Every structure is written in C-alpha cells, then in structure tokens.
Nucleic acid binder design. Structure first.
Lengths: 29, 615, 180, 70
RNA sequence: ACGGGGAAUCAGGGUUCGAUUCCGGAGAGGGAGCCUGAGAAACGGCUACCACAUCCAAGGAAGGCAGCAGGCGCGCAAAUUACCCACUCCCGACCCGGGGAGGUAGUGACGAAAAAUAACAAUACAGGACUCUUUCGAGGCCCUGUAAUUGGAAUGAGUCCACUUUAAAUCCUUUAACGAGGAUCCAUUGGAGGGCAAGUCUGGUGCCAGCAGCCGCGGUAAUUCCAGCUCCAAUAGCGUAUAUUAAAGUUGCUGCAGUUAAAAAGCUCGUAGUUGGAUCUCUCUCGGCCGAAGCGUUUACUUUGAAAAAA
C-alpha cells in the first residue's frame, strides 16, 4: 500500500522513495 | 611580476635556473674521460638465447674480457666516440642479476616477439623494480624473422601486454647492427634515472680478480681486485664491503694504467692506524609434520583476520602470574611510556645516536660539499685488501662478479633498524612474527629475524603477529647500520633453496627508540545485565585478581567504554559500570600491553640460491 | 598546406534532458516498430526533419511573390515529393509543417524490403540488406537507411549473385551437400 | 608539492584502500575536485583529488586491473 | 593581443574564441651594420658585439632546426631519423635536370560519416490476444519468452591464391578456397534515495571504512558504503578534470532591480553629456517636344543601383 506507506513515512528518511512510489501508483500506465 | 618585461625577465631567470641544474649531474656518467657506460642485458623469455643477440651488437672494436661462463665485454666505436660496457645475465637467477644490476647505469631488456615474458623472468623483474631501477629500455629480437605482414601485428600484439608492467615505452627491435646502431644512440640519449643510494658512496665493478694468499693453511689471503671507480671520491681510510662476503679493511690502493682507454704502477695512498676506524660491531666494554604445521598456519593465521587477539584465559594458573608482565593503557596513543624502563642485555650491545637526522645531514654534507684526498672517479684503480678468504676467488672463475663499495662513518656497528615492507602478492604463504628471512637492505645480504609492526606516527606501535597483504608493515631487527635511503627485499626458502620473494619496501629510521608493543586481549562475557551495571562471566576466575586488574579500563565489541566496579562472585564474576546500556549480543574484553624486543639471530652468510623456476 | 578538405558535419542532436519518460517511451516504440539499432537512428531522422521545418518556417515570412520563396520553396517540396514523403496534391509550403518522423522512416530501404514482402519481419530486412542480398535496379545496396525514392520503389529485388534470387547456394548448403 | 611552480597542495585520495597504493615521495597526477577551486562538501579546504599514482591509474589499481610499479 | 576571412553557442537580441593550412604583417638566439642585385637591411649571405657552444697538435678553425625527420628539456599536453617527383605546381640556359614545396604510406578513439555482435521455422507453455461454449474447454488465427528445446538455411570478421589500385606498394572495391551453436568469433562505461531512467532484495560493516556535484547516507534491520543478483541509460563507446556558451530577465538595448530582502547622493546650484511644446500644400543659355548645364540650405533616414577574394 503506497497510500499508507506515504502517510506514515513522508517524514522519515524514506520520504522521497515513498513519494516516488505514490506518484507511480496514482499516475499509472 | 610587474609590466611585461620584468615578467619576461622573471621567466628567463627561472628558465636559466632549471636548465643549469639539470646539467650539474649529467656529467656523472659516460663522458670522454669515461667511466664506462655499463649496460646490463637480460632476456626475459627463456626461448631467447642470449648469445644470439650479443654477437650482432659486437661490431666498433670488440674487447672480449673473458669471464667464467658469460661473455662480459667492452665496446669502442669512435664514429660516435663513446665507451660502452656490456654485461649480461640470465632470467630468474637471483645471484648473478642482483649483484651487478645494482651498480649498473643501464638495463637492457630483451623481450620475445610472441609473448611478453615467461613465468621465471617475471620473478627477477619484480626484484629489479623494488631494488631501484636504473635507465631501462625494451628490446625485441624476432620481429623481422616473421613474415612481411606478421611483423606489424607482432609489435602491436605485444605492446599492450607489456603495459601492466611497463606503462609506456617504445620497442627497439634487434635484427641487424644497423638496427642496433639506432639502439646505441637511443641508449646514449636517455633521461638518466639517478639511483639515490649510490650517489653518496663510492662503488666499483670487478674487471679482473687476482689472488695470492698470505698463508695457505688458514685458507685466507689478500686480493688484487681491479676495476673502475664509479661513485664518489674513494677515500683510503674508509671500510670496504664485498656484497656477499662481509666487511673488512683494505691496506693499499694504487692506480695502474687504463687497459681500455677511449682514444690511445704509482703508489699514492697508504692506510695508517691513526685514522682507520676499528672493526667491531658491538661495544667491547660490557615432511608431513611440517604439513601439520602448514595446515594450522592456514588456520592460526586465520584466527587473526577475524579475531584481533582472542586468546583463552588461563583456568589453572592465576591471572597475576600468567599475565604478570603486561600493563593496561588508558589511551594507546596519548599515554606516557618510559622508553628505557627495562633494557634487555642485548641493548647494551648496540649503538646509539644523539639526533639521527642532524647527524645524517652532517655526514651527507661532507661527501658532497667537502673534498677529501681520496682518488677521484673515472680512474682505473686496482686494490690490495688485507684479509679475505680464498673462497671469493674461484667463484669469480665460475662467472659471478664481486662488488665492493666504501662505507660512511658509523656504518659497521650494530643498532636497531626499522624498515617499511609491503607484502608482495606473488606469494600466498603466511609468515610468523619471528621467522627467518633473507634480507637485501641496500647492497647488503643477510638473514635475520624481524618484528612485524604497524606504520603509524605515534610513539607506540602494536605488534602484528603475522603478515598481511594490504597494510604496509614495519620490520624491526638488529643489523649493521645503513644510512637511509635503501631499497629492501625479503625472501624465504620454500624448498630446494628456491628463494620466494614475499616482501618489498624501503627503509625507515634506524633507532632503538621505536616502541613495538605486544598486546593480549582478555575476552569475557556479561551474563546478567542491569540498568547500567553488568555481571561478567568467564573473564577472570579468581576473586582476588579482579582487584588487580580493576584500574585497567574495559571496552566492548560494540564501542562501549567501561571499567570494573566491584567483584561479586567468589568465583570469577564481577560488577562493571558502563556508559551505554550493554546489549545482549556483546562481548566485553580488556586489553593488556607490554613491550617486546627482537631476537639476535644475525648472520652475514646467505646461501647462494638456485636458478629460480616454478613447481 | 595540404590538398585535403576538413568540411564535415554532425548528423544528429541529443536531447536537452537525458532522463525523461515518454520521450524514452516514444523513441523506444519507434525503435521497435522500424527495426532500428539505437537511439541515434531516431535522433538522426529527427534532425533532418528539424532542418526541413526550419527552412520552410523561414520561407513563410517572405510574401507569396518573393523570388527566393518561389524558387527555393518549390525546390524544397520537389525533394519531399521525390522521396515519397509528401504526396503531389499537398505541395503548398504548409503541409511541410504537417510531416512527422514516421513519414521519413517509412521510406528507408529496410522497411521497404519488409513492405514488399522480400522479408518476413522488420529485423529480417536488416540482415537481408546487410548480408548483401538486396539490389536496387542494378546495384547491390548494403545500407539499411537508404531512403528509397519514388521511382526506385518498383525495382527492388534479390541480387543475382545471392542464394535467394540468383541460385548459387551459400556456405552452409554446399557443405551439407559435401556431407551427403 | 607541485613540480611546475613549487606550490603545495592537499589532495584527497578518493576510494577505500586507495591510500594503500601510495608511499611517500611518489609522483601523482592531481585533478580538481569538481567545484572549480572550491571545496567539496564534507572535506574542509580541499580542492584537488589524486588521479594517477606512479604513472598508473587509481581506478586501475582499485579495481585490480594493474599492479603498483616500484 | 599578430589582425582579418572565420569558429562555438544561440528563439530574438547576445556572448566567447580565432597560435592553426587562405589573405596581409613580422621574425630567424638578442640588438646593430652591410655586400650583391630589378627586388633583401636576406640570416639553409657576410661583418661586429652580447649570450651559448663544436673541433684543436693551444698557433687557430668553424657555428644558428620558429624547414622535414629525429633528440634533450619543459610540461596536463602532441606522430616516422620512412618512400617518390607519378599528381599539383615552381625554378633553370631547359619537351630532358631539380624540389622534405608537395604527394604516398606509418603512428593517430582530435574529431566527423556509415555501421556487425544474429535472423528464421516446427514443438511445448498451467503464456497473452481473437470465434464458440453460461463455464470447464474447444483452434496453425495473431503475438511473447529466465525454452543453456531441436532444426537447417544466410553471412561476414578473420585466414588467404589472383586481378585491380599505385611511381612501386598498402588500404578499400572485385573474386578463388577455408571460415559460426554456450554462433567462448561472450560489449563496454556509469548508475539504481531525490533532482534523474532504474530494487526500503540478500550477505558484510556499524558515524568506522567510506559514499555523496547538491540535499544528504553510515551509531546492529544502510532504499545511498563493500559485494552478489536483478534492473536502468547511452552504446564502440562511456566516465572525470578544466576553459567557454546556453540555461542567466543572476549584467537586463530588447529586458532586471533600489520603502522593509543588496541598494536613492544630506540638501541645492551648475558646465559638458543626454533629451526638448504648437506651427509652413525645379528652371535658365545650346543640340536632335527630347537630352546637357545649373540647382535648392546643409544633413540624418529610407529605397534602388555598383563595388565588395576564394574557402
């Protein structure tokens, strides 16, 4: 779940990675 | 700089400054006065027979000075008016290469067209690079002996397979003497690599050795060694070291006529007793069982690259008895240590310095900035030595040359030499901290028993019990004093007297003040942990020695500092305060330290190695 | 002084932004569709289109009765009809701006060998051109990016020395005949 | 200590175990660090990095392609 | 800083480079003076001096590679002491001789152009898609492969006779013969946190080693170090360093800013500079009506013409 992992880890060291993964899920192809 | 003319002037001075300093050492070699242009030639690949090529470069005028086996001759072609000198050696032979490629001015390598080199030539190639290479030139022999298309590839299929040894150089081939005529010009106009060792001492090469003994029953007499002087001004009151047969004092020099001049008997110096320094190294006043050792040396070495000094604590004898001699340091670099607290009785047999660098700069200045009354270079001086045994004579009739060179003051006694080594990765065998190894420390040859140590700038140094392949280590041993710099080689007989090259490097400062320290790590285990307290099983066993090692600070394997607080067991348990909270995975361990001194196993005799081959 | 000419010219431009999705995607679709080798074969055909758009975009500022526009503009459309990219009824100077990369890539010799049926895939055309099996009117052509003109489209065939059209078999068939 | 004007320079030996290919008094080709005469972040006041030692490349020694010449 | 023709970049404006093969200048170690000649202040001429430096029998003699090669030195930094006057042209008494001018090879990943490293077919898939079955499932209809599954057909790279090329050779082009199944005849260079395409996979290390242009990473579960696998980008090329151009509307003419972010002179006078309000609708003495000659106060502007080296 990219939604939850972004909503949890947007503050941590892994913020850039979970934002990348969330845009991958939202935009999509 | 200021204004275009005082910038063009400012360039002209510094151009003149550099262009005149490069000329003040060019006349060190091969002038019209002519200390002869020594060219050592070796073939790498054993397919290349050396009498194939030397006949082709023989003819200006050829003078075959006969030797034991190899033809070591001199050449004069006065269409270019220079005096060449040709010596020749064989690949892999450590004896006949290393003794006259050390006084040589030029090395001429002969490569094969097919491959670069065989396996045995790569061996003596490694020792020559670490000994200090003179001016070197590649050469090849069988290029035009290949077809008219297959020779433009053969230089090109070779010259990249040389660069992992020889990064860039052109290759002058050898098929004709009109091919070799372009070699001697290329040989003549090089950039002269200056060997930093030899341009402070006065050395010589043997052209003809003559002998008559004083007495025959004692098998020792006096030599008539003849050859050119090639170093500095050879003083008469200095000592004389033959490179393979120890040090001694000569009694008479005399300059005969030059047997080989470029363009075509008087006694002058004698040795007194008042100036000649005395010869004393010390102060006068006071198969499967070794395989069973081999398989554990692939293992007891490997207890060092995963565990630093994990020893077993003594269960039988008390801890104040087994590790009585050691001590604990609060900080390994910033602790005080008296450098002369416990001198061994061997340190009453070595020589000291008041300040090594400032006594080096005063003995460096006198050979160059001061002119002594010795015989000047370029001459042909034969020499009468006092007392050398007869064994040095007939081996010259076998073919090896004998090299003798003068010594600086305070170069005959004993001290404690420190020398940087790097382990050569051509060998894979482990070496203990107190083995017997063949040392080649700056024109000397001796066996020794060193102490491997670490290369830091602080005063203390921790003993490395074995040899590693990547960290640069320092050997430490009693040896005669050689002033730095000096190139080092280290060998070891594997079997049949074959010398395995294991370590190369250079020389550090010779002094006994280098503190080499043997450690021992006492490992324990904490088994009841609390809030910032700890109960450590197994580190000690008695109750009383916990108060002995109480002031010695503790460390863990996870970086935690700590110290012993109290004991709580009548058995070997203890309470220890700490700074972080200990983890359940930890292993608390303490460090014990003591000084260590090397062994006195010095011997000037080295066995002559065999032709080095593979197995 | 020498009798040499140093007049050369690069035939491609690389993009301003190197890692851009949907530029990467579109050029990979054009590589796979037309059997090309690398990106530089798309950047080359993007470059000759950008030279043709730019020269027409210059000629569109001069008026309809300019000398230079009437001469040089009619000579630009003549080449684009000649190589078969434009048609004949679209020879105003404003159907140049409606050309694309795919119009220029359909005229290579590789895709025309595939279109005429002398191959059976777009990668089978690359080898059949490159192994010297394909000739144009008399001449063996060894280059896949040979832009086939409109009059040379009716003469593309199988190269009379080849095992496919001519008849003397290759290296492999004759050795198997030796082992028969 | 630079050859062509005598000036002195502290240069950074880049990868790991790359000081172990260098001894003293060795000849070293030095580059810039990449910021055109300014320091590169972590290191204070260091504007240069070693490229080649002993006329062989550090990337050739680190990756084990060649041997250190003595 | 030799100058131009030009070169790189560029929406438009611009900016920077131009030692370098064409034109023009200068100079032959540094200044100076001459002879000869149509032409030189000439250096592959001479005479001096200053600076280097060769031989010498010690009395003397001879020098000038910023020509082609080659050497040393310098340096981050640059090729052969090769062949030929056959080409392009030049000199001479000359259809004939000569030319390191120039041409031809060699070295050459400066750089630019083309362009291999595989294609195809039959099977099988617990692969996808198209027609039917409610669905199981029925098919050469179209595609795909972590099939090191099978199978012949195609071919260069090499090896190599011959021709051709050339002064003579080479190279390419053309052809014999051999030449591919892990077609081992193996493609590399950087990367995988974000800028920015692409793994919080596994092992090791534990603010160490080290990475990282920037932000940041590493203190025992490291998406970032050292490696294995996998994936990505360009691809016979790809990293790094420095100069420079765009990005930079962060030098601003186009086209920036100035209360508080960097910034309006303490105030006023003032010469140069810069900028300045309305207003004004072709003819005389001659030649065969058509040309001369004059203008009108002088210009800026704009349009045409002719002159602007080739590359």
């Amino acid at each position: 779940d990219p939604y939850e992992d972004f909503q949890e880890n947007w503050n941590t060291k892994h913020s850039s990675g979970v934002t990348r993964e969330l845009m991958r899920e939202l935009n999509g192809g | 700089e200021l204004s275009r003319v005082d910038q063009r002037h400012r360039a002209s001075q510094l151009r003149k400054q550099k262009k005149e300093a490069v000329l003040a050492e060019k006349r060190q070699l091969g002038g019209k006065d002519g200390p002869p242009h020594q060219v050592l030639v070796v073939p790498l690949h054993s397919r290349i027979s050396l009498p194939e090529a030397m006949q082709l470069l023989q003819d200006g005028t050829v003078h075959l000075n006969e030797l034991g086996n190899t033809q070591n001759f001199m050449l004069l072609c006065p269409r270019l008016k220079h005096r060449w000198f040709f010596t020749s050696a064989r690949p892999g032979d450590l004896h006949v290469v290393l003794d006259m490629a050390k006084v040589a001015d030029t090395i001429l390598f002969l490569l094969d067209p097919l491959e670069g080199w065989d396996s045995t030539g790569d061996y003596c190639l490694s020792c020559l690079f670490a000994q200090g290479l003179p001016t070197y030139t590649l050469a090849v022999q069988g290029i035009s002996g290949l077809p008219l298309k297959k020779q433009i590839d053969t230089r090109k299929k070779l010259s990249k397979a040389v660069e992992k040894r020889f990064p860039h150089d052109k290759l002058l081939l050898l098929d004709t003497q009109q091919e070799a005529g372009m070699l001697l010009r290329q040989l003549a106009n090089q950039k002269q690599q200056h060997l930093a060792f030899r341009d402070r001492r006065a050395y010589l090469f043997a052209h003809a050795v003559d002998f008559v003994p004083s007495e025959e029953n004692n098998l020792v007499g006096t030599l008539k060694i003849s050859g050119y002087v090639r170093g500095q001004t050879l003083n008469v009151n200095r000592l004389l070291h033959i490179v393979g047969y120890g040090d001694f004092q000569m009694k008479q020099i005399d300059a005969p006529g030059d047997p080989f001049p470029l363009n075509p008997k008087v006694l002058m110096k004698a040795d007194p007793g008042r100036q000649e320094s005395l010869q004393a190294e010390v102060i006068p006043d006071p198969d499967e069982e070794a395989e069973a050792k081999m398989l554990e040396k692939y293992k007891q070495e490997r207890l060092e690259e995963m565990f630093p000094d994990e020893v077993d604590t003594p269960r039988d004898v008390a801890a104040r008895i087994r590790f009585q001699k050691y001590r604990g340091l609060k900080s390994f670099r910033t602790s005080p240590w008296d450098p002369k607290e416990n001198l061994p009785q061997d340190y009453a047999r070595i020589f000291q310095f008041q300040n090594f660098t400032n006594t080096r700069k005063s003995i460096f200045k006198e050979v160059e900035e001061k002119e002594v009354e010795g015989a000047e270079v370029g001459w042909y001086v034969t020499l009468h030595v006092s007392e050398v045994p007869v064994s040095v004579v007939e081996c010259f009739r076998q073919g090896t040359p004998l090299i003798a060179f003068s010594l600086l003051p305070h170069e005959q006694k004993m001290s404690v030499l420190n020398m940087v080594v790097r382990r050569d990765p051509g060998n894979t065998e482990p070496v203990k901290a107190k083995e017997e190894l063949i040392f080649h420390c700056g024109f000397r040859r001796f066996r020794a028993s060193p102490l491997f140590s670490q290369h830091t700038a602080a005063d203390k140094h921790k003993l490395q019990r074995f040899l590693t392949a990547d960290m640069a280590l320092v050997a430490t041993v009693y040896a005669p004093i050689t002033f730095p710099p000096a190139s080092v080689l280290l060998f070891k007989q594997k079997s049949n007297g074959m010398h395995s090259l294991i370590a190369t490097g250079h020389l550090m400062s010779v002094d006994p003040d280098r503190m080499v320290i043997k450690r021992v790590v006492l490992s324990g285990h904490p088994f009841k942990i609390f809030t910032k307290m700890a109960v450590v099983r197994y580190m000690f066993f008695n109750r009383e020695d916990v108060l002995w090692f109480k002031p010695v600070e503790l460390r863990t394997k996870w970086g935690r500092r700590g110290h012993i607080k109290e004991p709580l067991g009548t058995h070997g348990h203890m309470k220890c305060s700490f700074d972080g909270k200990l983890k359940s995975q930890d292993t608390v361990l303490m460090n014990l330290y003591k000084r260590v001194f090397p062994k006195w196993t010095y011997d000037p005799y080295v066995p002559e190695p065999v032709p080095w081959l593979k197995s | 002084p020498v009798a040499r000419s140093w007049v050369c010219r690069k035939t491609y431009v690389t993009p301003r932004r190197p890692f851009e999705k949907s530029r990467l995607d579109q050029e990979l679709k054009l590589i796979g569709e037309y059997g090309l080798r690398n990106k530089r074969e798309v950047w080359r055909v993007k470059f000759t289109l950008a030279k043709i758009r730019k020269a027409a975009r210059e000629l569109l500022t001069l008026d309809e009765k300019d000398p230079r526009r009437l001469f040089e503009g009619n000579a630009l459309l003549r080449r684009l009809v000649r190589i078969g990219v434009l048609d004949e009824g679209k020879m105003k100077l404003d159907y140049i701006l409606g050309l694309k990369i795919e119009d220029f890539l359909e005229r290579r010799l590789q895709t025309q060998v595939f279109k005429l049926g002398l191959a059976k895939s777009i990668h089978h055309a690359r080898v059949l051109i490159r192994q010297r099996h394909i000739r144009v009117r008399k001449q063996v052509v060894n280059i896949p990016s040979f832009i086939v003109r409109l009059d040379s489209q009716k003469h593309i065939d199988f190269s009379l020395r080849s095992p496919y059209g001519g008849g003397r078999p290759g290296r492999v068939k004759r050795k198997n005949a030796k082992k028969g | 200590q630079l050859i062509k004007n005598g000036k002195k320079i502290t240069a950074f030996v880049p990868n790991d175990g790359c000081l172990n290919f260098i001894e003293e008094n060795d000849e070293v080709l030095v580059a810039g660090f990449g910021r055109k005469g300014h320091a590169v972040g972590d290191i204070p006041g260091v504007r240069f990095k070693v490229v080649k030692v002993a006329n062989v490349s550090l990337l050739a020694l680190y990756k084990g392609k060649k041997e250190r010449p003595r």
